[PDB]
Design a binder for this molecule. Structure first.
Ligand SMILES: OC[C@H]1O[C@H](O[C@H]2[C@@H](O)[C@H](O)[C@@H](CO)O[C@@H]2O)[C@@H](O)[C@@H](O)[C@@H]1O
Ligand SMILES: OC[C@H]1O[C@H](O[C@H]2[C@@H](O)[C@H](O)[C@@H](CO)O[C@H]2O)[C@@H](O)[C@@H](O)[C@@H]1O
Lengths: 101, 103
């Protein structure tokens, strides 16, 4: 993971991470990834190894360089604040954001 | 954005846009993008900078080349007609649909 060391000017909008990331040729690329493919809302907490968190979460934000923050619904349908470190699994590969396991 | 300038046979089904786009060096690729990731319903109006419009909108359609049209609930729970131009932020990047920023 660790895209945040390869990238800058990062932003969160909805479930899409955008970032500007370094390229081996000296340039850079503006990249984007839909995090909803790889993050699940499990009982109010953001977790890896699933999907579709955006259906049951609101108010997504980037905190610092790599933390996704949101408010998500528990199974009993109430809201809690939650966060996940995107650096865990989001990398930059020659300027392009990618999920890595 | 401006995908519609490089793309063909676009379609919307639920929250998903699918299109067939000219690749940078020739030929075509087909890709999809889930618009639910980047479009919110604010009081009956489709807007960028949020997500999950599909929870409170229905009957989504493609109008012309690039407009998402749906019926979305206002806060008062009245369905109203709304549209958003997907060319605002959806690009064709070497034949693949991608959300892009404002720079
Ligand atoms: O309903 C879509 C939802 O399904 C799964 O989430 C389950 C649970 O973890 C949630 O707390 C509640 C919130 O209402 O919904 C579920 O029952 C996950 O796939 C989740 O990502 C998704 O949004
Ligand atoms: O309930 C999910 C819904 O939340 C937001 O919408 C707000 C409001 O703008 C909308 O008119 C009504 C419709 O009932 O729901 C409100 O509380 C927004 O994030 C939207 O995208 C989402 O569907």
């Amino acid at each position: 993971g660790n895209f945040s060391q390869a990238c800058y000017n990062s932003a969160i909008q909805g479930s899409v991470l955008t970032s500007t990331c370094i390229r081996t040729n000296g340039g850079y690329n503006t990249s984007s990834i839909d995090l909803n493919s790889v993050i699940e809302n499990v009982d109010g907490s953001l977790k890896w190894q699933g999907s579709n968190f955006i259906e049951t979460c609101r108010n997504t934000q980037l905190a610092g360089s790599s933390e996704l923050a949101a408010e998500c619904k528990t199974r009993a349908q109430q809201f809690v604040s939650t966060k996940i470190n995107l650096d865990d699994h989001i990398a930059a590969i020659d300027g392009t954001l990618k999920y890595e396991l």
